[PDB]
Design a protein around this ligand. Structure first.
Ligand SMILES: [O-]S(O)(O)c1ccc(-c2c3nc(c(-c4ccc(S([O-])(O)O)cc4)c4ccc([nH]4)c(-c4ccc(S([O-])(O)O)cc4)c4nc(c(-c5ccc(S([O-])(O)O)cc5)c5ccc2[nH]5)C=C4)C=C3)cc1
Ligand SMILES: [O-]S(O)(O)c1ccc(-c2c3nc(c(-c4ccc(S([O-])(O)O)cc4)c4ccc([nH]4)c(-c4ccc(S([O-])(O)O)cc4)c4nc(c(-c5ccc(S([O-])(O)O)cc5)c5ccc2[nH]5)C=C4)C=C3)cc1
Ligand SMILES: [O-]S(O)(O)c1ccc(-c2c3nc(c(-c4ccc(S([O-])(O)O)cc4)c4ccc([nH]4)c(-c4ccc(S([O-])(O)O)cc4)c4nc(c(-c5ccc(S([O-])(O)O)cc5)c5ccc2[nH]5)C=C4)C=C3)cc1
Ligand SMILES: [O-]S(O)(O)c1ccc(-c2c3nc(c(-c4ccc(S([O-])(O)O)cc4)c4ccc([nH]4)c(-c4ccc(S([O-])(O)O)cc4)c4nc(c(-c5ccc(S([O-])(O)O)cc5)c5ccc2[nH]5)C=C4)C=C3)cc1
Ligand SMILES: [O-]S(O)(O)c1ccc(-c2c3nc(c(-c4ccc(S([O-])(O)O)cc4)c4ccc([nH]4)c(-c4ccc(S([O-])(O)O)cc4)c4nc(c(-c5ccc(S([O-])(O)O)cc5)c5ccc2[nH]5)C=C4)C=C3)cc1
Ligand SMILES: [O-]S(O)(O)c1ccc(-c2c3nc(c(-c4ccc(S([O-])(O)O)cc4)c4ccc([nH]4)c(-c4ccc(S([O-])(O)O)cc4)c4nc(c(-c5ccc(S([O-])(O)O)cc5)c5ccc2[nH]5)C=C4)C=C3)cc1
Ligand SMILES: [O-]S(O)(O)c1ccc(-c2c3nc(c(-c4ccc(S([O-])(O)O)cc4)c4ccc([nH]4)c(-c4ccc(S([O-])(O)O)cc4)c4nc(c(-c5ccc(S([O-])(O)O)cc5)c5ccc2[nH]5)C=C4)C=C3)cc1
Ligand SMILES: [O-]S(O)(O)c1ccc(-c2c3nc(c(-c4ccc(S([O-])(O)O)cc4)c4ccc([nH]4)c(-c4ccc(S([O-])(O)O)cc4)c4nc(c(-c5ccc(S([O-])(O)O)cc5)c5ccc2[nH]5)C=C4)C=C3)cc1
Ligand SMILES: [O-]S(O)(O)c1ccc(-c2c3nc(c(-c4ccc(S([O-])(O)O)cc4)c4ccc([nH]4)c(-c4ccc(S([O-])(O)O)cc4)c4nc(c(-c5ccc(S([O-])(O)O)cc5)c5ccc2[nH]5)C=C4)C=C3)cc1
Ligand SMILES: OC[C@H]1O[C@@H](O[C@H]2[C@H](O)[C@@H](O)[C@H](O)O[C@@H]2CO)[C@H](O)[C@@H](O)[C@H]1O
Ligand SMILES: OC[C@H]1O[C@@H](O[C@H]2[C@H](O)[C@@H](O)[C@H](O)O[C@@H]2CO)[C@H](O)[C@@H](O)[C@H]1O
Ligand SMILES: [Ca+2]
Ligand SMILES: [Ca+2]
Ligand SMILES: [Ca+2]
Ligand SMILES: [Ca+2]
Ligand SMILES: [Mn+2]
Ligand SMILES: [Mn+2]
Ligand SMILES: [Mn+2]
Ligand SMILES: [Mn+2]
Lengths: 232, 232, 232, 232
């Protein structure tokens, strides 16, 4: 088979394996701070430098992958806790949308919240302009921040969250498991046809944004990944 | 919410948190050995002592759970590697099935292969008698050792395996992810209405079995489980 | 190591994790009410279903635990505020003591005040019969409602109390810390060889009681416990 | 009674309630980083600005106090993970020891490892000059980094540790509970007569340190404190 795997217990802004886009910045403790606190419409993104072949136009096969990461969101005084983080998969040439308003677009969509990407957002602000549920939530996005599905969730300031994703090729079922601070788990699943919505060669990564009045600390602590494509 | 969460990195007899049914023997290194090598038809199971209420006849809700565990199956000179391990869910009153012999009921069914439980199997020996695919496989059993679905897997002697399982309360999707020694990941997923096959209170555990000519060591090295039942 | 850890921010009947002995009634708001207000000699207890092995006859070791919980005791027109709540440890086979009447056995002892258990009491009514200090107090009981040690405390109707308990495996020191509504903290500590007073397997819970003339509401709002038993 | 209490969920540089002594620095996410990864014998300390009256001259009374905090230590490449963190209590005019060598001294002792303070160290480097145990440990210090008592412990790089301390005046008992990322809890208690080892007015705080090759990320994330002195 064709297997891809990596593991980051910490980061550094000189590692060739990571692509930094936007106001991204690496802290002294090894964490990645996606957005700039005192910047209007801040947008930061981070992608694994190397492109993962998730499916073969040849065989007709699709890869299965298991990844898990942990992040932290914290409130900053006088500023609305927004907008959130999103784990995304996109074509290898993915860029921050030209003139991106930031905020509710999470840095992977245009003003009408559209774009070419599949992702799991950890939304902390309700954008009626995107059909956002009235409360914090977790969602499965498929080429739009107007989630195909969401599940109520609760963002605790300054608490480390742990996430475990699984994509089973056979069923094209993307399943998420989120371990909240109080021990409680939150799950959400959706059937997404990756071959159908993305190219053979893509890229994974994290993005986060905010507005002028909406800002908060977005930190990625660790990230491990392993994809496996059957070649037969 | 109502959440159950335990974690075992080692084991030891006498712990009130675990019930040992069968030829289960705890090694002097905190490892659980499921079957007796010197017996014909050995059978052993390890269960988490307390019944966990997976769904509520009142809420109508069904819990989601995130459980991951590791095991090892080493071969033994002049013996067919069998029958394999199995992670399962059963009615709180679950008694250990009748030991059988040439058989491979994985310790959860009768000679015919029937039984009241739902589980993920890591089978290493084919039995025309239960539709066992030609080779080693990972399956999804629902009241029968004749898996509902199966996927090609390969068991490697003396290799430690890591397994992450996720269950989505809504989508009723059971998603497994097998991480092998070399790195490659195997995954399978299936819908199983837990509220349709199991009583409100069930029990989680691992089971194994052997035959007259099929035997091997079945080691459960670690186990961590977490389930959350929304009720409101 | 061998660790037990649960967490309840709310309660609900039917949860297999908790056993209800006596006049325990679960409110429609996830709160536990220990005594019945319309009964003479009400008595109620709530216990964590599974027995926790506090010490090993093999290791000689004794587990340490960190448990914290919150409660509330509101008065009721024309009634003496009593008897108080109590956090205790008992032999796994613990039955609920005989309901008594003028009495104040806190639901863990006989008419005389004897019983097999060890606990921290939050007593709000003096009984010359058991040496109750002149006023409200927090005590450390060891097989007797006649506290081994006591410290002046003051119970305030309708106030939510936070309590953090720590037990050191070695020093055999049980240390309580009562946080009142206004802020002030009350603390008491006592050596109690858990391995000397209790059998290997015990049970943790909260108990309460009332009299003919003494009654009040006893609410257990939340509970989080964690114990670790070193074994190697 | 006289009670002192505060609570921090994140710190800031321009906060007169906190005294920053040494290589201290406050990250963008509100955490405090006690040492500088680039200096040689980097020493950092942070004290609560206002002094606390732990014992009354008039009345041979001493205060009880409850406090809990969480930290994170991480390994930095090419440097030994050292030296650790310490929660200390010192006279209100306390400073960094003249010409401190940092390292084994944890920034609160001279070269012989002596000074004026009562602390709880989370040691990560075995120094034979201070009779350190051979493994990571938690210790109780009384005017010397040569612990009056210690307990084996394990520091995990990048993991959030939660700590809870309780000091009972009546017993002059100091008990700690450390909650590892693991879920496991480590404990350690010691009887320290504060009035006998410290001045009426003290200051509480944290500290960390490193050497030439011994360096790591030391971070304080939160800190809550309450102390109540009886005055009758
Ligand atoms: O007549 S026989 O019976 O004998 C017989 C002859 C040939 C075959 C082979 C074959 N491919 C081989 C290699 C190979 C492997 C190793 C070595 S070696 O190790 O070096 O020796 C040498 C050669 C090989 C290497 C790369 C590819 N094949 C790639 C490919 C290209 C580009 C990319 S890309 O874009 O990513 O660069 C990605 C993948 C493709 N192959 C197909 C394809 C196909 C499927 C469906 C449809 S359709 O029906 O239309 O859907 C259309 C086309 C077929 C159909 C038959 C077939 N490939 C599509 C893409 C070796 C044999 C089988 C039997
Ligand atoms: O009749 S006979 O008995 O005579 C007989 C004749 C031919 C065959 C073979 C064959 N493939 C071989 C290699 C091979 C192995 C080792 C070496 S060696 O190392 O040199 O030894 C050299 C060559 C080989 C290597 C790689 C591939 N084949 C790849 C492939 C390409 C790209 C990728 S990827 O992932 O990189 O993109 C992954 C996989 C493919 N092969 C097919 C394919 C096919 C399937 C379905 C459909 S259909 O359903 O109709 O669409 C259309 C086509 C067939 C059908 C028959 C067939 N391949 C599709 C992809 C060797 C033999 C078997 C029996
Ligand atoms: O009937 S016969 O005469 O035919 C006959 C049948 C079977 C046996 C064997 C046997 N083990 C073998 C290997 C082996 C050797 C060489 C190769 S080869 O070189 O590759 O060929 C391959 C395999 C082998 C390899 C590893 C082990 N055995 C391990 C083990 C597992 C896991 C770990 S771990 O955890 O560290 O990973 C560490 C160690 C154990 N084995 C026991 C054990 C046992 C003891 C006491 C109790 S009790 O009663 O409860 O006290 C319960 C169970 C028995 C009982 C019988 C028995 N093992 C416990 C642990 C080969 C044969 C002997 C005779
Ligand atoms: O229900 S199930 O389907 O699950 C099922 C459950 C159990 C069984 C088996 C069984 N024995 C086997 C072998 C075996 C055969 C072939 C190979 S192989 O060749 O490798 O294939 C490997 C192993 C096997 C080999 C040797 C023996 N059994 C010997 C024995 C040992 C030593 C000597 S001696 O004296 O010579 O040393 C003499 C005899 C005995 N076996 C019994 C015995 C018994 C007799 C009377 C009474 S009672 O009435 O109470 O008195 C009580 C019990 C039973 C009862 C059941 C039973 N044996 C008594 C002695 C294989 C299976 C089968 C099916
Ligand atoms: O026999 S008699 O006739 O004599 C008789 C004896 C006792 C009662 C009372 C009673 N409540 C009172 C106050 C009260 C009265 C007067 C003053 S005064 O004005 O000062 O005098 C002050 C306070 C009072 C105040 C607040 C509440 N009660 C709240 C409550 C609190 C918080 C929240 S929350 O979540 O919003 O925080 C939500 C709800 C609840 N009360 C119930 C409840 C219940 C219903 C169904 C189910 S079940 O079917 O099982 O589901 C379970 C439980 C009952 C059942 C009987 C009953 N309450 C559930 C919630 C006073 C009397 C009635 C008649
Ligand atoms: O026999 S007699 O005639 O003498 C007689 C004796 C006792 C009673 C009372 C009583 N409650 C009173 C107050 C009260 C009123 C005014 C003041 S005053 O203003 O100070 O004067 C002070 C105090 C009072 C205040 C708050 C409550 N009661 C709350 C409550 C709990 C929790 C919360 S909260 O928010 O924490 O959740 C909020 C509210 C509850 N009360 C019940 C309850 C109950 C119902 C069903 C079931 S069951 O069997 O299960 O169906 C079990 C239990 C009963 C049953 C009898 C009863 N309450 C459940 C919740 C005053 C009297 C009436 C008559
Ligand atoms: O073991 S312990 O020590 O714990 C202990 C446990 C229980 C008891 C009590 C008790 N009753 C009390 C009051 C009371 C007194 C004073 C005040 S106060 O003054 O306010 O303080 C407050 C409350 C009290 C008031 C009214 C009644 N009791 C009424 C009653 C109600 C209504 C009417 S009516 O018809 O007029 O409406 C008529 C009679 C009855 N009581 C019984 C009865 C019984 C009789 C025969 C049979 S059997 O032989 O089996 O058939 C079965 C049961 C028993 C058995 C035990 C018992 N009552 C039958 C009717 C106070 C305590 C004492 C000690
Ligand atoms: O017999 S009579 O009935 O006539 C009678 C007369 C006097 C007393 C009082 C008393 N103190 C009062 C205040 C007070 C309170 C409120 C207000 S008001 O609210 O303003 O009105 C006004 C005044 C008061 C305020 C501050 C102090 N007292 C301080 C003090 C000073 C400095 C500090 S410091 O360091 O923090 O600055 C800390 C503490 C001390 N007081 C003693 C002390 C003592 C104990 C043991 C020993 S020994 O045996 O040697 O051990 C030596 C000394 C005694 C002994 C008796 C006594 N104090 C030691 C320190 C009010 C009355 C009782 C009975
Ligand atoms: O004749 S009678 O019998 O009738 C009789 C006469 C006098 C007394 C009183 C009394 N103190 C009062 C206040 C008071 C209360 C409220 C207000 S109000 O608010 O205005 O109303 C105003 C004043 C009062 C306030 C503060 C103190 N007293 C403090 C004190 C100071 C500083 C601190 S601290 O912590 O801040 O440093 C903490 C505590 C102390 N008081 C003593 C003390 C003592 C103990 C042991 C020893 S010995 O063992 O011998 O050494 C020697 C001395 C005594 C002995 C008797 C006595 N105090 C030691 C410290 C009011 C009355 C009682 C009965
Ligand atoms: O409040 C956070 C929220 O802001 C929205 O945009 C606001 C903008 O922040 C505010 O300054 C302006 O006056 O009105 C805008 C429209 O509500 C973002 O659109 C949303 O995504 C959050 O970031
Ligand atoms: O190894 C960490 C350890 O260092 C000790 O000091 C060393 C110093 O780090 C090294 O660079 C120098 O060459 O020798 C010194 C003497 O051992 C510290 O004393 C100790 O506390 C740790 O920080
Ligand atoms: Ca949003
Ligand atoms: Ca089989
Ligand atoms: Ca009492
Ligand atoms: Ca040291
Ligand atoms: Mn959304
Ligand atoms: Mn099978
Ligand atoms: Mn008492
Ligand atoms: Mn030390």
């Amino acid at each position: 088979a064709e297997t891809v795997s990596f593991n980051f217990n910490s980061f550094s802004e000189g590692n060739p394996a990571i692509n930094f886009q936007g106001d991204v910045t690496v802290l002294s403790n090894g964490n990645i701070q996606l957005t700039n606190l005192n910047k209007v419409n801040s947008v930061g993104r981070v992608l694994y430098a190397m492109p993962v072949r998730i499916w073969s136009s040849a065989t007709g096969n699709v890869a299965s992958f298991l990844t898990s990461f942990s992040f932290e969101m914290k409130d900053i005084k006088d500023y609305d806790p927004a907008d959130g983080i999103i784990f995304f998969i996109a074509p290898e040439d993915t860029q921050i949308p030209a003139g991106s308003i930031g905020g509710g677009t999470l840095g992977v969509s245009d003003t009408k919240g559209a774009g070419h990407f599949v992702g799991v957002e950890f939304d902390t602000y309700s954008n009626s302009e995107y059909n956002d549920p009235p409360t914090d939530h977790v969602g499965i996005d498929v080429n739009s921040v107007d989630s195909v599905k969401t599940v109520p969730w609760n963002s605790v300031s300054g608490a480390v969250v742990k996430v475990t994703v699984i994509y089973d090729s056979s069923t094209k079922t993307l399943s998420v498991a989120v371990t909240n601070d109080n021990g409680d788990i939150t799950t959400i699943a959706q059937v997404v046809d990756l071959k159908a919505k993305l190219p053979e060669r893509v890229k994974f990564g994290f993005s986060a944004s905010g507005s002028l009045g909406g800002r908060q600390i977005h930190l990625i602590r660790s990230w491990s990944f392993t994809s496996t494509l059957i070649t037969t």
